[PDB]
């Protein structure tokens, strides 16, 4: 997360850290962030799984404030099966969505706690006013230029961009489709050292807004050009466009 502030997992119980390993099992590296929707299902970004990993080589860790430092009440699960949206495009990142089924001993996997809780999926008709300030979280880079991921969970705050302003023109000629969302810090000349923004490592993480008293998921950190770049917003997958897909692929 570029800019923003350090946050404790309890402020974003729905954040998931997904780790993966290498040949010969030398060590499991931080892959991407995830979003907890139900006890055994977490969403993430399809692009994170472009290397076609064997499920049992993917570990989702819930309830963890520090990226690699194990939490007092965390919950580590192995992936049974992960579904990657078939129409996902690697160039345009169109359809950047995926589901990870958690492996458990019962009908429930993630046991709800003070540090582990689900996000409420957005209603089909969710129409949040342009410029409403939503927040995001992640263990990703602080600078896209940085060689290191964040040792600890971070949170930032972005303003939802109007439909019209979320176009190819406004994003250096990259393909922005109707399945994408734009949000980005809109401050200038303030007291803060960095524009708020997601960054490399935050992918798959949640962009949540307050809706009807509850924190509702609005988008999945998908892509962007740099991090905290003046007048360039960040792109997020429209979760509403995939409410249907989500319900359909959640097979036990």
């Amino acid at each position: 997360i570029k800019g923003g502030l350090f946050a404790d997992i309890a402020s974003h119980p729905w954040q998931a850290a997904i780790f993966a390993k290498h040949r010969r099992s030398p060590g499991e590296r931080f892959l991407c962030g995830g979003i907890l929707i139900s006890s055994c299902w977490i969403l993430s970004a399809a692009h994170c799984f472009q290397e076609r990993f064997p499920p049992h080589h993917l570990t989702v860790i819930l309830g963890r404030t520090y990226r690699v430092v194990p939490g007092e009440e965390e919950q580590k699960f192995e992936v049974e099966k992960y579904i990657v949206h078939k129409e996902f495009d690697d160039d345009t990142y169109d359809n950047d969505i995926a589901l990870l089924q958690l492996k458990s001993d019962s009908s429930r996997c993630a046991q709800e706690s003070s540090v582990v809780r689900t996000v409420c999926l957005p209603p089909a008709d969710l129409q949040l006013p342009d410029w409403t300030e939503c927040e995001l979280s992640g263990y990703g880079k602080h600078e896209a230029l940085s060689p290191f991921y964040s040792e600890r969970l971070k949170e930032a705050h972005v303003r939802l961009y109007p439909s019209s302003r979320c176009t190819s023109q406004h994003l250096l000629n990259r393909t922005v489709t109707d399945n994408m969302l734009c949000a980005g810090d809109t401050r200038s000349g303030g007291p803060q050292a960095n524009l708020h923004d997601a960054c490399q490592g935050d992918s798959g993480g949640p962009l949540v807004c307050l809706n009807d008293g509850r924190m509702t998921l609005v988008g999945i950190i998908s892509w962007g050009l740099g991090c905290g770049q003046k007048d360039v917003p960040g792109v997020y997958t429209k979760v509403t466009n995939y409410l249907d897909w989500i319900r359909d692929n959640m097979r036990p």
Binding site: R117, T118, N211, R214, M215
Partner: peptide
């Protein structure tokens, strides 16, 4: 339930 946290 979902959407709840600590503030």
């Amino acid at each position: 339930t979902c959407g709840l946290r600590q503030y």
